[PDB]
Amino acid sequence: MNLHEYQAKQLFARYGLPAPVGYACTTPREAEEAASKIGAGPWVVKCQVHAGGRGKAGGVKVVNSKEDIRAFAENWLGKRLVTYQTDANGQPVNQILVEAATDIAKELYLGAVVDRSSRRVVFMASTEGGVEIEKVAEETPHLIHKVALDPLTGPMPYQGRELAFKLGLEGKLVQQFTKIFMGLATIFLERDLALIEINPLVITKQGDLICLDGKLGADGNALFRQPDLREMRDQSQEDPREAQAAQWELNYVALDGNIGCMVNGAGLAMGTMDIVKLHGGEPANFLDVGGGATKERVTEAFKIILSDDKVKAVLVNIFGGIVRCDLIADGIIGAVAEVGVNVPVVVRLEGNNAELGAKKLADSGLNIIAAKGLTDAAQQVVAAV
């Protein structure tokens, strides 16, 4: 899961890593009162949403009066910010971060992720701060420096030093960098992180390192042992249907199409979306039925898929699992019946009693086409549209 910038900075602070003096505000009144607590202006005001590119979207500004801070807050609180990293609806802004302005001398880049290729936690540093690191990579790769954490020894000072020297730092900036490196590496391992991005990591005119921005991602699979992180999840930043599906042990992700997909298995789910696309169809979503395809869970699946007005048809594809196709066929019928599905439903059952099930479906009397083979099923749903 992702954390808000203000939440990330609060964590860096707990680990003794420099961040601007700031305050998270939920009302325009808190925002303007923050100014005096901070000190003399100008002040920086930032909308807090998980997506990046907030600046380009006008969610980041430097203001000169309490009056302006207030105006910024009253303009964003309650609205949805739209960045190049959000859908068209953007994300809700329920917090404005108000912090002290910083005298920038230079912008650096410091990040960390789990490199699946070398199977290690890897830190990247670059002198090209304030830019989409991905671009720096493909264009000037020699400007990106990396080090991998040794599973046997944990982070070591010489590694923080290595990056510092490669970035051309010198004097107290070298120790400052190493300290930051050791700190972030420690957080990463202790809090079971997945991603860390200090962009930019700024060198001030006064000659110090400070984290002007911050991005953290935690390994969801580890939240069972990360009490604090667990509490920082902000549901409003995601599609509510996603969390809703997870509750019923379903994996959902919305798309743009008129054909709903309900499949058991992530791989098969993606494969079925692909085959529909292949035969001229436009998949409306991704929905992987995790738990057994009971009447109840299948019902929730339908409700969730159909909550999208764009859906004109629904393709169901289920292979084996822990139940028999005839039983699953009944559950699907019971489900369709109870929800009152108002669109064509093409089902494809496979496994134990595959035919006995296809039969019950063909005879349900409801609007259920029992396909024969995956390719057939695909052609028919695309057809029904």
């Binding site: 992720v113 789990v114 699946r116 290729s117 199977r119 290690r120 936690v121 991905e134 599973p151 046997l152 391992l189 079971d192 997945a194 390994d219 699979n221 580890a222 069972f224 042992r225 994996n251 992700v253 798309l255 058991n264 298995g265 992530a266 791989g267 098969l268 789910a269 993606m270 494969g271 979306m273 692909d274 085959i275 696309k277 292949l278 998949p283 991704f286 992987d288 995790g290 292979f319 084996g320 699992g321 496979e350 496994g351 134990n352 083979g373 995956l374 390719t375």
Partner: protein, 286 residues
């Protein structure tokens, strides 16, 4: 066949739990040589007609088992996997889903350093039709044969199995390497095994978005795999940066897309199919 056969003696960690019981039962029925299970605190008792032990070491001392299937919930897998490595187990099949990445990162280093083989985690298991079954896959759809299968997914694998069974080719051994970011064994590990396996005449490779295990296997196949390989990649219609179910099914940094992997496998001369429905067909073509 590879990894397991009719003589593999197997113990189960998490033997007395819900999934451990159910699937061990299925395995016993299939004819797998289950010789006992391990559940701390329940040692000295018997379950499914087999002996239960308090530690993996005790179980190995008494049964000489060389393989262990794990049905322990995520929070305790790093512990039970490391216990198995220590007890002397040589083959570990971890079915568990939800293990922390940083945990597998360390476990993987230990596995290599210790010379122990692990399939998974987050896998349906491993099966040599007619000889041995370890996992949660439906046995009745497999058929002793010549095609070897390696996949990062579960049910999607069954499609290939059904097809290869229908075309009569059958399967030598089916290995699900799992859907996590840092698996115990990757494509190349299993591929090399199929090359040396005389019973395997062809190979079906099933992958998906995320990472670069496929691209790396491509290069390896070109270089060291002489047998024919049919490859399928799922996730062409998937969005970048979103997790699609499996913890490993996510396009990060814009790298590791479906098309990207197809292209890579093709440049290495691998017969790739664009409809999971045509795997059986492409196979016959070789």
């Amino acid at each position: 066949s590879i990894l397991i056969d009719k003589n593999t003696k197997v113990i189960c960690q998490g033997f007395t739990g819900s999934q451990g019981t159910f699937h061990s039962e299925q395995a016993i029925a299939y004819g797998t040589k289950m010789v006992g299970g391990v559940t701390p605190g329940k040692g000295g008792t018997t379950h499914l007609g087999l002996p239960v032990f308090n530690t993996v070491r005790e179980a190995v001392a008494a049964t000489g088992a060389t393989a262990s299937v794990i049905y322990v919930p995520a929070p305790f897998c790093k512990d039970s996997i490391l216990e198995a490595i220590d007890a002397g187990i040589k083959l570990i099949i971890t079915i568990t889903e939800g293990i922390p990445t940083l945990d597998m990162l360390t476990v993987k280093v230990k596995l290599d350093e210790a010379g122990v083989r692990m399939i998974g985690p987050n896998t349906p298991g491993v099966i040599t039709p007619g000889e041995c079954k370890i996992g949660i896959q439906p046995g009745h759809i497999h058929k002793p044969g010549k095609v070897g299968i390696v996949s990062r997914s579960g049910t999607l694998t069954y499609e290939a199995v059904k097809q290869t069974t229908d075309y009569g080719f059958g399967q030598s051994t089916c290995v699900g390497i799992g859907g996590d970011p840092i698996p115990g064994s990757n494509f190349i590990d299993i591929l090399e095994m199929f090359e040396k396996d005389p019973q395997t005449e062809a190979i079906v490779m099933i992958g998906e978005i995320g990472g670069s295990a496929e691209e790396e296997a491509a290069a390896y196949i070109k270089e060291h795999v002489t047998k024919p390989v049919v490859g399928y990649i799922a996730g062409v219609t998937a969005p970048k940066g979103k997790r699609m179910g499996h913890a490993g099914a996510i396009i990060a940094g814009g790298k590791g897309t479906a098309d990207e992997k197809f292209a890579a496998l093709e440049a290495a001369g691998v017969k790739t199919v664009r409809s999971l429905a045509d795997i059986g067909e492409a196979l016959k073509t070789v």
